[PDB]
Structure formats: C-alpha cells, structure tokens
C-alpha cells in the first residue's frame, strides 16, 4: 500500500510540472496573440486610407 502512495505522489508531481510548463508557454502564446491583434488594426486602417485615396484620385 505504501508503494501505491509513492507511485501516486510521483505521478501527481509529474502532472504538476507539466501543468506549470503549459501555463508558462501559454502566457507566451497570449502575448504573441495580443501583438498580432495590435498589428492587424493598423494594417486595415492604412489599407482603407490608401484605397480611398486611389479611388478619389481617379
């Protein structure tokens, strides 16, 4: 029975480490997502201005 508890302890420790790694990497993921979200708005605004200017010139 003691060996059983040892096995559960080891397994739960491993699971906790895996969860910790997932949390940190996902924090990085979210930072990247925020960066791309910031960029796309400027993309769209500049494109809209250029399209309106080109249409007006013609």
* Min separation Cβ 28 and another protein, Å: 5
Segment 24-43, which members bind another protein (CB under 8 A)?
24-37, 39-43
> Could you count the other beta carbons within 10 Å of the beta carbon of residue 53?
9
* Min separation Cβ 56 and another protein, Å: 10
DSSP result, 4-47: HHHHHHHHHHHHHHHHHHHHHHHHHHHHHHHHHHHHHHHHHHHH
Q: Which residues bind another protein (CB under 8 A)?
A: 1-2, 4-16, 18-37, 39-51, 53-55, 57-58
């Amino acid at each position: 029975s003691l060996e059983s508890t040892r096995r559960m302890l080891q397994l739960v420790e491993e699971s906790k480490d895996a969860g910790i790694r997932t949390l940190v990497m996902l924090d990085e993921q979210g930072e990247q997502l925020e960066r791309i979200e910031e960029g796309m708005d400027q993309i769209n605004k500049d494109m809209k201005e250029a399209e309106k200017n080109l249409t007006d010139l013609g």
